[PDB]
Amino acid sequence: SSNRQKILERTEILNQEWKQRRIQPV
Amino acid sequence: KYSFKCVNSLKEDHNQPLFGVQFNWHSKEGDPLVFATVGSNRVTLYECHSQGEIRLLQSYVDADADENFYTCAWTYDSNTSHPLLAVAGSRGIIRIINPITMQCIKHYVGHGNAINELKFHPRDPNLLLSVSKDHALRLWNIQTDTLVAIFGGVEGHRDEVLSADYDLLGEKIMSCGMDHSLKLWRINSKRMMNAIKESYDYFISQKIHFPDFSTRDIHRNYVDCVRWLGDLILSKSCENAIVCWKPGKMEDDIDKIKPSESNVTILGRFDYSQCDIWYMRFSMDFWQKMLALGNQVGKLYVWDLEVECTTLTHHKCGAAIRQTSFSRDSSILIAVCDDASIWRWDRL
Numbered sequence: 278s279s280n281r282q283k284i285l286e287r288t289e290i291l292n293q294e295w296k297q298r299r300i301q302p303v
Numbered sequence: 304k305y306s307f308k309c310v311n312s313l314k315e316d317h318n319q320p321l322f323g324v325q326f327n328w329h330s331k332e333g334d335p336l337v338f339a340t341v342g343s344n345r346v347t348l349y350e351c352h353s354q355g356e357i358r359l360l361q362s363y364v365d366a367d368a369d370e371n372f373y374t375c376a377w378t379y380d381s382n383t384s385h386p387l388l389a390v391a392g393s394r395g396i397i398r399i400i401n402p403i404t405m406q407c408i409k410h411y412v413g414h415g416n417a418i419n420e421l422k423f424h425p426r427d428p429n430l431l432l433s434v435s436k437d438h439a440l441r442l443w444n445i446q447t448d449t450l451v452a453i454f455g456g457v458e459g460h461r462d463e464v465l466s467a468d469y470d471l472l473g474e475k476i477m478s479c480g481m482d483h484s485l486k487l488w489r490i491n492s493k494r495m496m497n498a499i500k501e502s503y504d505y506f507i508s509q510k511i512h513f514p515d516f517s518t519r520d521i522h523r524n525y526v527d528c529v530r531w532l533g534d535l536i537l538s539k540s541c542e543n544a545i546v547c548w549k550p551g552k553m554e555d556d557i558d559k560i561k562p563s564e565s566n567v568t569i570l571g572r573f574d575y576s577q578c579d580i581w582y583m584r585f586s587m588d589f590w591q592k593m594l595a596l597g598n599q600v601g602k603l604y605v606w607d608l609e610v611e612c613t614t615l616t617h618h619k620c621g622a623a624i625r626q627t628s629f630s631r632d633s634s635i636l637i638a639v640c641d642d643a644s645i646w647r648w649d650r651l
């Protein structure tokens with residue numbers, strides 16, 4: 278579905294932002 | 304296609320209901336999987352290790368024995384990359400806890416009553432949303448310690464707000480509660496973007512009385528969980544179904560919906576049984592490929608969102624599962640219960 282494509286592209290943007298980060302482990 | 308094995312369980316010694324559980328999705332690839340649980344006046348951190356090991360890391364015990372935590376949410380410090388954990392509940396106080404030391408950094412008083420859910424903005428780690436028993440939602444900037452906005456008033460909720468969610472890009476919020484309604488609040492409006500920018504320059508909070516959409520036509524009882532699924536919404540009441548729906552007619556663009564829009568379109572329902580009691584959350588994994596919901600007799604339902612059901616049971620798990628949480632890589636699923644028990648399910 279078209280909605281699933283929006284989920285893919287938007288979660289990919291958040292994943293790329295997460296991949297750029299190096300948060301200290303708890 | 305998704306199968307799981309129950310590898311471990313435990314019970315917290317306070318023996319009170321656990322209402323919230325969250326894996327820290329901010330931990331970097333190659334770092335240990337950590338989750339927090341909340342219930343009673345407690346916040347406890349655990350680390351997941353191989354062979355189903357659940358390692359107790361530390362616990363925060365509130366000085367107030369009458370505090371009852373209902374929710375927690377993870378974030379990080381935008382300058383030091385240090386993890387942070389926000390918690391809140393019956394007392395209506397937001398506590399920002401340092402998870403490395405389990406000490407409280409600071410707290411926010413504001414809500415006139417109990418806080419039912421906390422959520423962090425998906426792009427700005429400083430933007431914290433709280434939903435409350437006082438019928439309002441509040442947006443906080445935890446960098447400058449400012450109340451950005453209060454969403455409530457003339458056309459706000461008319462009873463406790465139970466849940467809310469930001470969309471994937473953090474442009475809008477959908478809230479829901481005891482008045483049976485689901486309300487949309489856009490935060491990418493010129494007004495809200497400027498209020499957020501001003502919170503960084505600091506305070507006069509925005510008072511948003513009018514939502515960008517509202518419906519009472521999805522459920523016929525308390526709406527206790529809402530999440531965005533792209534431009535669609537997933538929401539549940541105690542009617543043994545999670546409803547997938549959208550504002551307006553079938554072909555209506557979510558960003559062209561006018562505030563007076565009278566229509567809703569139902570796209571489907573996830574049907575289940577024995578989850579007719581109030582205050583039961585569902586959850587999704589990071590990629591929104593799986594949907595999970597526990598029921599009042601300890602069964603855990605898992606659906607594949609990339610097709611439209613797997614039932615996970617253990618003979619010793621018979622208490623209501625209040626909330627579940629997937630690890631970021633979706634390899635682990637944790638369920639927390641009304642009897643203080645915690646269950647670890649590993650994906651096969």
Ligand SMILES: N=C(N)N1CCC[C@H](Cc2cccc3c2OCO3)C1
Binds near residue numbers: 323465466527625
């Ligand atoms: N509003 C109340 N009276 N509460 C007592 C019971 C827990 C409530 C917090 C909560 C709200 C909605 C869905 C939930 C949830 O906890 C687990 O799933 C707070």
